[PDB]
Structure formats: structure tokens, C-alpha cells
Write a protein that binds this ligand. Structure first.
Ligand SMILES: CCCCC(=O)N(Cc1ccc(-c2ccccc2-c2nn[nH]n2)cc1)[C@H](C(=O)O)C(C)C
Ligand SMILES: CCCCC(=O)N(Cc1ccc(-c2ccccc2-c2nn[nH]n2)cc1)[C@H](C(=O)O)C(C)C
Ligand SMILES: CCCCC(=O)N(Cc1ccc(-c2ccccc2-c2nn[nH]n2)cc1)[C@H](C(=O)O)C(C)C
Length: 290
């Protein structure tokens, strides 16, 4: 086989605190003894994922993450298993979820909204260029590294579209109610443009402090999405409002940035992004949130 480092094993690490608990996974900070490097190790119990029919999501996460090579994504460095567990060695995003910052500060100023929006747009341009739909983009899945650059995660519900068939639509029903696109609800398929709908909701949330479609329960949220039933608060940055209006469009072929709208060029050219230097965002110093 191709030359590669020795496969790792649990005894190669000292495990420390739990960083997160999921319904079928747990993430633990670990130090690799031989290097002193720190990883976030996602651990899944084989019996549990077998019983709860989660193996396809686990295999999907490994397959999609292994294809990514870009600074705005959590990195999958290695995987291994033992008799009871599967292990993913991921980069550790020390500053946690973007959602945490929205909640603490209430909403972002225009400079920070623009910067973080531009990072997300650049990450989506990369993903869509590889024919990958995220399908569950939301602030909880946009992590922040030590330098406050984004690290998008949660690829177990992502989809690699088939280049051989020029596949544009994916059929699995996945996502989170507040960010799900109208085409997934009504046509039961998603496309790359479904991520641009989620982007619109995220920009709105950064400025307004709440996602645009919101209610106590999921069904009520769905009813608002399909009617495009939302409003802006009064002081919303005007160019950001124009951008959100060009993303939160019911017809998935009419969202700025989608292929039918001639792609990322026109989206990056939107007036909200006038000052952005798109070429090397990950090398730029992020603006301070407070
Ligand atoms: C190492 C974890 C357990 C893996 C394994 O070895 N197994 C379970 C299983 C389940 C689902 C899949 C799967 C993966 C991707 C896409 C679809 C599916 C799937 N498979 N069925 N429905 N969806 C693979 C393995 C055996 C088997 O089922 O082969 C059992 C006997 C323990
Ligand atoms: C409907 C597919 C059902 C499963 C199956 O049958 N497949 C895929 C697969 C993927 C992943 C695993 C897996 C997941 C977690 C941990 C270990 C494993 C694993 N992988 N190998 N052994 N265990 C298992 C099966 C065959 C194969 O893998 O070839 C298809 C492609 C014919
Ligand atoms: C049962 C191990 C032999 C199967 C094997 O070798 N492969 C399939 C594979 C690999 C890794 C996983 C996996 C998924 C989630 C978490 C950990 C692991 C894991 N298990 N062991 N290490 N990582 C599932 C299936 C290779 C590959 O598809 O990459 C082939 C191409 C050589």
C-alpha cells in the first residue's frame, strides 16, 4: 500500500476533558504522547451506532472529510478503531461555536459580519467546487480556531454529488429546521443552492441575533419558510439586507452564488463585500468582536 504513518491506537494518547457530547458520539481532548500534539478525538461506540442505524453517517463523515484540504474546515488527520469503538482524530477548534459568540454579544457589527460572511462564502465556494453539499450549515457547525478563523464541521450529513451523472440534486432528508431550504421541504431534494439559503439565514442571524425563521416547534418553522415569512429589524445594515434578500429566495435557481446565477463571481462582487480581499482571508487578522 501507499507509504503512510503507522496507524494510531488509543494507547498513543493521553485523554483529557470531554469537549462535546452527541447523541451517538463523544469528543475528547487528547494529547499524542510521541509529539505532544493535541487533537479533538471523536469517539463512537460500535454497538450503539450499529443499533441506532448510524453507521452510514459515520462512514459518510469519514469519506467527505478525507476529501477536504482547505483552511476553513475542521481537519480529519487520522482514524482508527479498537474492539468497541471508532475514533476520528480532528483538529481542535479552541474557540468553539460561532453560535456562542452570537449569543454572548447579541449581534455582530458590520465589519465582523462582513469578515465572517466572507470566510463562509469562501469555504462554500471550495466545497461546491468539489461538488459537495454540506446540507446542515448553521452557526453551531461553524467553529472558530485559536486565531478566530472559521472551521466548518459536521460532514456526516454532507453529500458528494456524482460527477459521472452530473448530479445536481441529493435525496436524503437531512438538516436543521431553522436553516432547511424550501426545496428540501417541498421537493424532498437539496442542491448546492440549499447551502446558499442557509448562508442567508446565517448572515441574518449575525446581524439580527436570531435566525429569520423561528418558532417553538419545527412544523411552524416549515410553514414560515415555504411562505418566505420573515422580516428585518429596523437597523439592519442596508447592504447586508440586500444580500440576504438575494439569498433567501424560494426558487433555488435564483439565489446569488448558485450555478444558474453564474456562480461565486457575482456573489463575491456584491456591494456588501466591496472592501473584502478574497484571495488570502485565512492569513488576514480577523476583526475583534468587541
Ligand atoms: C464497524 C461498525 C459496524 C460495521 C459492520 O461491520 N456492520 C454494520 C454496518 C451497518 C451499516 C453499514 C453501511 C455503511 C454505509 C452505507 C450503508 C450501510 C448500510 N448497511 N445496511 N444498511 N445500510 C455498514 C455496516 C455489519 C454489517 O451490516 O455488514 C453488521 C453485521 C455488524
Ligand atoms: C449497503 C452497504 C453496506 C456495507 C457494505 O457492505 N460495504 C460498505 C461499508 C462501508 C463502511 C463499513 C465500515 C464502517 C465503519 C467501520 C468499519 C467499516 C468496515 N469496512 N470494511 N470492513 N468494516 C463497512 C462497509 C461494502 C464494502 O465495504 O465493500 C460495499 C462497498 C460492498
Ligand atoms: C475494518 C478496517 C478495514 C477497512 C479498510 O481498510 N478501509 C475501509 C474503512 C476504513 C475506515 C473506516 C472507519 C470509519 C470511521 C471511523 C474509523 C474508521 C477506521 N477503521 N480503521 N481505521 N479507521 C471504515 C472503513 C480502507 C478505506 O476505505 O479507507 C481501505 C480503502 C483500505
Amino acid at each position: 500500500p501507499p507509504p503512510q504513518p503507522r496507524k494510531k491506537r488509543p494507547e498513543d494518547f493521553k485523554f483529557g476533558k470531554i469537549l462535546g457530547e452527541g447523541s451517538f458520539s463523544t469528543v475528547v481532548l487528547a494529547r499524542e504522547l510521541a509529539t505532544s500534539r493535541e487533537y479533538a478525538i471523536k469517539i463512537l461506540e460500535k454497538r450503539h451506532i450499529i443499533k441506532e442505524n448510524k453507521v452510514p453517517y459515520v462512514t459518510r463523515e469519514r469519506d467527505v472529510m478525507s476529501r477536504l484540504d482547505h483552511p476553513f474546515f475542521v481537519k480529519l488527520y487520522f482514524t482508527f478503531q479498537d474492539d468497541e469503538k471508532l475514533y476520528f482524530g480532528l483538529s481542535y477548534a479552541k474557540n468553539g461555536e460561532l453560535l456562542k459568540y452570537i449569543r454572548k454579544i447579541g449581534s455582530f457589527d458590520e465589519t465582523c459580519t462582513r469578515f465572517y460572511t466572507a470566510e463562509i462564502v469562501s469555504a462554500l465556494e471550495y466545497l461546491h467546487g468539489k461538488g459537495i453539499i454540506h446540507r446542515d450549515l448553521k452557526p453551531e457547525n461553524i467553529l472558530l480556531n485559536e486565531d478566530m478563523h472559521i472551521q466548518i464541521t459536521d460532514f456526516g450529513t454532507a453529500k458528494v454529488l456524482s460527477p459521472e451523472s452530473k448530479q445536481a440534486r441529493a435525496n436524503s432528508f437531512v438538516g436543521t429546521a431553522q436553516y432547511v431550504s424550501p426545496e428540501l421541504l417541498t421537493e424532498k431534494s437539496a442542491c448546492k443552492s440549499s447551502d446558499l439559503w442557509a448562508l442567508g439565514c446565517i448572515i441574518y442571524q449575525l446581524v439580527a441575533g436570531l435566525p429569520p425563521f423561528r418558532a417553538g416547534n419545527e412544523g411552524l418553522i416549515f410553514a414560515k419558510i415555504i411562505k418566505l415569512e420573515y422580516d428585518f429589524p429596523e437597523k439592519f445594515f442596508p447592504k447586508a439586507r440586500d444580500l440576504v434578500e438575494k439569498l433567501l429566495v424560494l426558487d433555488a435557481t435564483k439565489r446569488l452564488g448558485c450555478e444558474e446565477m453564474e456562480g461565486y463571481g457575482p456573489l463575491k462582487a456584491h456591494p456588501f463585500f466591496e472592501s473584502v480581499t478574497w484571495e488570502n482571508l485565512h492569513q488576514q487578522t480577523p476583526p475583534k468582536l468587541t
